[PDB]
C-alpha cells in the first residue's frame, strides 16, 4: 500500500472543486474540509464538495466532516478510493445520465442516503464498505426512469432503512458478494423480482 504523497495534509476549501471532462482529480491521499458550503445536516441547500462534469474522474481523497452535498456526478465518471469520513446530506449524487462507478473507498455516518440517483444511469459500487447509514442507494423518490445498480464486493454494517430503494418498476439492482449486517430490510423496490444476483 503506497499511501499517497499528500497524506497528512488538509486542504480547506471554500467553494466546490470542478473537475472537467476528461480530467482526473487525484488527491494523492489529501483530506478535504469544506467551509461555508454546508454543515452536513439533512438540509437540501448545501454545496457539493466536488462537481464531476461528464467524463471527469476523481481519486484518492478523504472527505472530512462536514460532508456538505458530497460529490455531484454528471455521468461517465470513475470515483476511486474516495473515503467519506462523515457523509453529509448524501455522499454522491448522479445528476445526469451515464455510467458512474464507485470503486474502493468507504463511507460512514450517513443520516439518510449514501448514493442518490436523480437521472437514468448505470451505477456500480465495487470493493466498498459503509457503516451507520440509512440507505446505500436511493433512486429519487417517485421517479420512474430506469437505473441499473450493481453492488459488487460491498460490505454494509448498520443500515437503518434498507440497502436500496426505488419507486421505479423498470429499475434493477444486481449484486455479487454483498455482505450486510444489521439491516432493517434489504430492498424496497416495487417488486422483489427487480433484484438479482450474478
Ligand X SMILES: O=C(O)[C@H]1O[C@H](O[C@@H]2[C@H](O)[C@@H](O)[C@@H](O[C@@H]3[C@H](O)[C@@H](O)[C@@H](O)O[C@@H]3C(=O)O)O[C@@H]2C(=O)O)[C@H](O)[C@@H](O)[C@H]1O
Euclidean distance between CA atoms 121 and 6, whole angstroms: 33
Q: Which of residues 20-49 bind ligand X (CB under 6 A)?
A: 44
> Cα-Cα-Cα-Cα dihedral of 39, 41, 44, 48, to 10°?
50
112 counts as binding Ca ion under rule CB under 5 A: yes
By CB atoms closer than 10 A (0-12, 13-18, 19+), residue 45 is exposed
Nearer to ligand X, 112 or 131 (CB): 112
Position with the least CB separation from Ca ion: 112
Please state, in angstroms and rounded to a whole number, the distance separating the CA atoms of residues 12 and 55. Answer: 25
Task: Render 121-151 in DSSP notation, one character per residue.
Answer: EEEEEEEEEEEEEEEEEEEPTT--S-EEEEE
Q: Choose the contact partner of 138 out of Cl ion, Ca ion, ligand X, none; CB within 5 to 8 A by kind.
A: ligand X
Q: Of 109, 111, 95, whose CA–CA distance to 63 is shortest?
A: 109
SS3 letters across 164-186: EECCCCCCEEEEEEEEEEEEEEE
Q: Is the Cβ–Cβ distance between 1 and 22 less than 8 Å?
A: no
Q: How many residues bind Ca ion (CB under 5 A)?
A: 8
Minimal distance, residue 67 CB to Ca ion, in Å: 6
Interface with Cl ion, residue 112, by CB under 5 A: yes
Tell me which residues in 157-176 interact with Cl ion (CB under 5 A).
161
Stretch that binds Cl ion, among 17-25, 97-105, 118-126, 134-142 (CB under 5 A): 134-142
State the binding partner of 166 from ligand X, Ca ion, Cl ion, none, CB within 5 to 8 A by kind. Answer: none
Interface residue with Ca ion, options 53, 69, 76, 80 (CB under 5 A): 69
Residue 84 is a binding residue for Ca ion (CB under 5 A): no
Distance CA 195, CA 172 (A): 6
Query: Measured from the CB of residue 30, what is the shortest distance to ligand X in angstroms?
Result: 25
Considering only residues 104 through 143, tell me which ones interact with ligand X, judged by CB under 6 A: 112, 116, 118, 138, 140-141
Which residues of this chain interact with ligand X, rule CB under 6 A? 44, 89-90, 93, 112, 116, 118, 138, 140-141, 165
Residues binding Ca ion (CB under 5 A): 42, 69, 86-87, 89-90, 109, 112
Amino acid at each position: 500500500h503506497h499511501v499517497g504523497t499528500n497524506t497528512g495534509g488538509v486542504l480547506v476549501i471554500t467553494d466546490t472543486i470542478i473537475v472537467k471532462s476528461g480530467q482526473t482529480y487525484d488527491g494523492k491521499g489529501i483530506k478535504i474540509i469544506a467551509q461555508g458550503m454546508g454543515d452536513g445536516s439533512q438540509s437540501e441547500n448545501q454545496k457539493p464538495i466536488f462537481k464531476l462534469e461528464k467524463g471527469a474522474n476523481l481519486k484518492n481523497v478523504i472527505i472530512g466532516a462536514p460532508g456538505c452535498d458530497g460529490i455531484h456526478c454528471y455521468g461517465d465518471n470513475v470515483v476511486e478510493n474516495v473515503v467519506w469520513e462523515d457523509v453529509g446530506e448524501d455522499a454522491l449524487t448522479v445528476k445526469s445520465e451515464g455510467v458512474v462507478e464507485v470503486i474502493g473507498g468507504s463511507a460512514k455516518e450517513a443520516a439518510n442516503a449514501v448514493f442518490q440517483l436523480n437521472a437514468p444511469c448505470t451505477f456500480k459500487v465495487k470493493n466498498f464498505t459503509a457503516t451507520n447509514i440509512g440507505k446505500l442507494v436511493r433512486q429519487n423518490g417517485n421517479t420512474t426512469f430506469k437505473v441499473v445498480i450493481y453492488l459488487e464486493d460491498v460490505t454494509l454494517n448498520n443500515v437503518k432503512s434498507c440497502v436500496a430503494k426505488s419507486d421505479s418498476p423498470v429499475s434493477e439492482l444486481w449484486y455479487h458478494n454483498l455482505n450486510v449486517n444489521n439491516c432493517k430490510t434489504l430492498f424496497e423496490f416495487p417488486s422483489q423480482s427487480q433484484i438479482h444476483q450474478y
